[PDB]
């Protein structure tokens, strides 16, 4: 055989990229916090008004609030070229909060998609008490499920010349864990909720079309807008992650430029993914006239 040596020189604009990401992340932090906080407040006040206010909406806002709230720790670590200045216990705690809440928010979207179709067909002769009970049961189940999937990553997350905190997975399964976990994150994050989103919005569009009274008040386009926005937020990031996995397994031949491209791509798409939590309030709450009226009341 022969050994080819590829000297990989330091990339020029790495510092610039990290500064740019911090610059985007601050905007994510501000907009996400503000949006979610006002939604939670308005949600509480709407129950007072006598509205059948969805439990799911309140929960979605809370879940997004937490994800957005774990941003500063990531920013601090990122500026120092992913070096870790905090403690191991800090690393574990921040990661667990980030993970549980992120999965939970996505799951609440999925619940709402199903709930639209159920509200038109099934729930219309169902007691008010019974539907509220169903929402509460689902709310507990989503939090529990979110907690369950988040836990393994935090367990193996341990702070490791230069200090970094990066998860060290079991000796004989390092590979397995890494790859496995991310794919679960991809499917549960995007494939499963996108499928649900598409199906129950296609059905919703069909149902509204069959109706004549409904379609006057409900736009046809906005239904598909929900589907397309979800697609846009998640697909690039998961593609970037998959490309990274391919490069590691070298089905993409190594180039210093390829590494630079991956580094840039992962970071940019990470910003796009984190924009998801900001955009969640707009789709389900802001469109509705009722929310706007309540929000005006709350504001004054």
């Amino acid at each position, epitope marked *: 055989i022969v050994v080819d040596t590829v000297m990989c020189p330091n990339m020029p604009n790495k510092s610039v990229l990290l500064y740019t990401l911090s610059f985007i992340y601050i905007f994510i932090f501000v907009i996400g916090m503000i949006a979610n906080s006002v939604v939670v407040w308005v949600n509480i006040q709407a129950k007072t008004t*006598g509205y059948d206010t969805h439990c799911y909406i309140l929960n979605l806002a809370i879940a997004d609030l937490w994800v957005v709230l774990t941003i500063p720790v990531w920013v601090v670590s990122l500026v120092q070229h992913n070096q870790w200045p905090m403690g191991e216990l800090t690393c574990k705690v921040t990661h667990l909060i980030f993970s549980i809440n992120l999965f939970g928010s996505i799951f609440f979207l999925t619940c709402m998609s199903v709930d639209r179709y159920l*509200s038109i067909t099934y729930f219309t002769n169902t*007691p*008010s008490s019974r539907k509220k009970m169903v929402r509460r049961v689902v709310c507990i189940l989503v939090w529990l499920l979110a907690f369950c999937v988040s836990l393994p990553d935090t367990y193996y997350l341990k702070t490791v010349n230069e200090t970094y905190c990066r998860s060290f997975y079991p000796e004989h399964s390092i590979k397995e864990w890494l790859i496995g976990m991310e794919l679960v994150s991809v499917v549960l994050g995007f494939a499963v909720p996108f499928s649900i989103i598409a199906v129950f919005y296609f059905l*919703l569009a069909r*149902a509204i079309s069959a109706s004549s009274d*409904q379609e006057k008040h409900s736009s046809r386009k906005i239904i598909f807008s929900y589907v397309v926005v979800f697609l846009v937020c998640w697909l690039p990031y998961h593609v970037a992650v998959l490309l990274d996995i391919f490069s590691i397994l070298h089905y993409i031949p190594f180039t210093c430029r390829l590494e630079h491209a991956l580094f840039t791509a992962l970071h940019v798409t990470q910003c796009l993914s984190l924009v998801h939590c900001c955009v969640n309030p707009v789709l389900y709450s802001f469109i509705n006239r009722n929310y706007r009226y309540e929000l005006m009341k709350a504001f004054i």
Partner: antibody
Amino acid sequence: VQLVESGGGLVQPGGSLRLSCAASGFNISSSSIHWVRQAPGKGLEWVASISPSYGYTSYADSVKGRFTISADTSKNTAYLQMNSLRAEDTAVYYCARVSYWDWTWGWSKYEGMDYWGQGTLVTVS
Amino acid sequence: DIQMTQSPSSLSDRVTITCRASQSVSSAVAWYQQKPGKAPKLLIYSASSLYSGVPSRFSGSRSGTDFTLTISSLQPEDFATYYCQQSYYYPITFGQGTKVE
């Protein structure tokens, strides 16, 4: 959206009788149809309801089991079918609609019965 | 049934109809107006939100289990047996009727 009742008449106790609430307009499987009886010189009392999507009926205790409610979605109409007639049953039977629109959903409210018929008089002589 | 005590059952103008509930029912009450030999017309669904084509004189409120329909100035279309309803729990339970003479 118009409701017209066809039925009523004089029918001896222990009998049966059917009423129809013909609906012209709205999809009747995206709304629940309820019946409310006003007994002569006495208060209202809920009678029956149906969500035709899954045929999810629901009846008041007084008429529980002994009345039946069945709907057709092909032509919008709901049918209240009575059995075991009594003086209790003597009333003017109105058909009412609880309506729904999916434009709002997440910031919904607890709607009442809004589109009401004109009612047929059932007498149990 | 989840009982409701609607009072007074006779009335005559500042008309208030107070409806108490046996259990906490949360804004699923309804009020009505059935003119004699004519089907009811909705006046207030939820607990304070009027239905379309229902005048501004009608005003709902919830004070726990003490719901109330208010008519600040009475009109000759208001002589009807108003029936308190709750739909929070099924069976849907109607009041005792509030005749307005």
